[PDB]
Amino acid sequence: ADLGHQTLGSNDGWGAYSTGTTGGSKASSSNVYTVSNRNQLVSALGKETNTTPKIIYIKGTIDMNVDDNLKPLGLNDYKDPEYDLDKYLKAYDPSTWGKKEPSGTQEEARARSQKNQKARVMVDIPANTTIVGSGTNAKVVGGNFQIKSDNVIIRNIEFQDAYDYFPQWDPTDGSSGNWNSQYDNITINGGTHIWIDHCTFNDGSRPDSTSPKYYGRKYQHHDGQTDASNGANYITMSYNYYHDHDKSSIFGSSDSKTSDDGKLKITLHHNRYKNIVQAAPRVRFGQVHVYNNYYEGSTSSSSYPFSYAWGIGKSSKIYAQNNVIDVPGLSAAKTISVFSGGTALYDSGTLLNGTQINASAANGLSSSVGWTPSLHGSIDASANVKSNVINQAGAGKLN
Ligand SMILES: O=C(O)[C@H]1O[C@H](O[C@@H]2[C@H](O)[C@@H](O)[C@@H](O[C@@H]3[C@H](O)[C@@H](O)[C@@H](O)O[C@@H]3C(=O)O)O[C@@H]2C(=O)O)[C@H](O)[C@@H](O)[C@H]1O
Numbered sequence: 001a002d003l004g005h006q007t008l009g010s011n012d013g014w015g016a017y018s019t020g021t022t023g024g025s026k027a028s029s030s031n032v033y034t035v036s037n038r039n040q041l042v043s044a045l046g047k048e049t050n051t052t053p054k055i056i057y058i059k060g061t062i063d064m065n066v067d068d069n070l071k072p073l074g075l076n077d078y079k080d081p082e083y084d085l086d087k088y089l090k091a092y093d094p095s096t097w098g099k100k101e102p103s104g105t106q107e108e109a110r111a112r113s114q115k116n117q118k119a120r121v122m123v124d125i126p127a128n129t130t131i132v133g134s135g136t137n138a139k140v141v142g143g144n145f146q147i148k149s150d151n152v153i154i155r156n157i158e159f160q161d162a163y164d165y166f167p168q169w170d171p172t173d174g175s176s177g178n179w180n181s182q183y184d185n186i187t188i189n190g191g192t193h194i195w196i197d198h199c200t201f202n203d204g205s206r207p208d209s210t211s212p213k214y215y216g217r218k219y220q221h222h223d224g225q226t227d228a229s230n231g232a233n234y235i236t237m238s239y240n241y242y243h244d245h246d247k248s249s250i251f252g253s254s255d256s257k258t259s260d261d262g263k264l265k266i267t268l269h270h271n272r273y274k275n276i277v278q279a280a281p282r283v284r285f286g287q288v289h290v291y292n293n294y295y296e297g298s299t300s301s302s303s304y305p306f307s308y309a310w311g312i313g314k315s316s317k318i319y320a321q322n323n324v325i326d327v328p329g330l331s332a333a334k335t336i337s338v339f340s341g342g343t344a345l346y347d348s349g350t351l352l353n354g355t356q357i358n359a360s361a362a363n364g365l366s367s368s369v370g371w372t373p374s375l376h377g378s379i380d381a382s383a384n385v386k387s388n389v390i391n392q393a394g395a396g397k398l399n
């Protein structure tokens with residue numbers, strides 16, 4: 001079968017659980033689309049009621065920041081009449097505003113502006129849908145696919161630059177504050193039975209090295225690459241190439257969201273993370289199988305410096321096997337970041353700079369996460385992960 005009609009293998013990660021992930025493989029003839037612009041993509045997807053099995057082939061580049069006539073849209077097109085970046089910056093400067101939450105005219109105008117862009121860039125994927133790239137050059141630019149539904153396959157697409165014209169300032173996000181933006185390449189918001197395979201995720205033409213710092217903090221226009229939230233469950237992400245991006249994959253969006261416990265069952269395998277800063281993945285609560293992934297970067301990089309690979313967040317249950325991390329000078333301990341509530345990590349065969357390490361022991365974590373994955377394909381020897389992943393991960397490696 002071609003990529004449009006292929007289903008997730010019956011053993012291929014958490015996505016294969018129960019009813020499995022078949023996406024739109026069973027689509028009848030009038031439910032197979034080929035789309036080459038935003039108008040065509042939106043028409044094909046339809047609304048949440050569009051639950052028939054459907055296949056969507058993406059041909060070439062789909063820019064999501066466009067109007068109904070496909071004319072490109074920018075900051076000034078989206079901007080609320082009351083919003084002004086200079087006045088936003090002056091309103092909320094820590095020096096005069098302090099550390100209280102931005103409120104009042106400029107923040108309300110920014111929030112309205114942000115909703116104006118969201119209306120164009122964010123698109124919901126309905127149940128029983130396969131979206132695949134035709135050829136080696138299928139691209140989604142500026143777009144945020146949201147999956148709240150069940151049974152969705154996304155393959156062979158390069159997602160670039162999910163860009164927010166209206167980052168919000170948070171003075172109490174960390175000790176010196178942070179700017180936060182809204183758009184991921186893919187947001188799994190309570191979505192279930194999902195396969196993301198052979199995709200590429202990057203910051204396109206506008207990497208973070210092109211944004212200034214305001215209040216000493218990067219004016220961050222991006223958010224996640226593949227995020228999973230609000231009871232998202234039964235997901236396989238395989239052979240994807242994540243590169244040149246800050247916060248990659250946050251699974252579980254809140255320590256308060258205790259309903260995520262027993263959910264966020266996600267398998268990550270054969271993914272490449274090159275020049276990714278953090279959250280690869282960052283996990284709260286979930287039983288996440290992480291195997292045969294390759295991580296490569298530099299702590300001294302001026303564009304996207306490596307901070308950590310795995311985020312051991314509150315009640316996380318990461319099961320890691322034969323992953324390979326190549327970050328010069330990095331200690332075994334610093335491969336991961338442990339957050340409050342995170343006490344356990346299973347990792348075997350972890351290679352750091354060619355040397356076998358124990359990331360869990362190096363961080364005083366428990367070695368048991370209370371589960372062992374039964375749904376997985378063949379496990380590569382760590383010795384072969386770098387070659388296999390570089391050669392195979394990402395869009396355009398199949399077509
Ligand atoms: O699903 C989301 O995108 C999620 O994003 C925010 O949260 C994440 C993370 O869950 C938060 O803990 C927070 O991260 C911390 C710092 O802000 C960040 O600079 C870095 O140091 O990591 C910290 C951490 O891992 O805890 O912010 C994250 C982010 O900016 O994406 C939203 O707060 C959350 O509501 C949700 O949208």
Ligand SMILES: [Ca+2]
Pocket residue numbers: 173178180
């Ligand atoms: Ca943040």
Ligand SMILES: [Ca+2]
Pocket residue numbers: 181223224
């Ligand atoms: Ca975020």
Ligand SMILES: [Ca+2]
Pocket residue numbers: 182183184187223224227
């Ligand atoms: Ca997000």
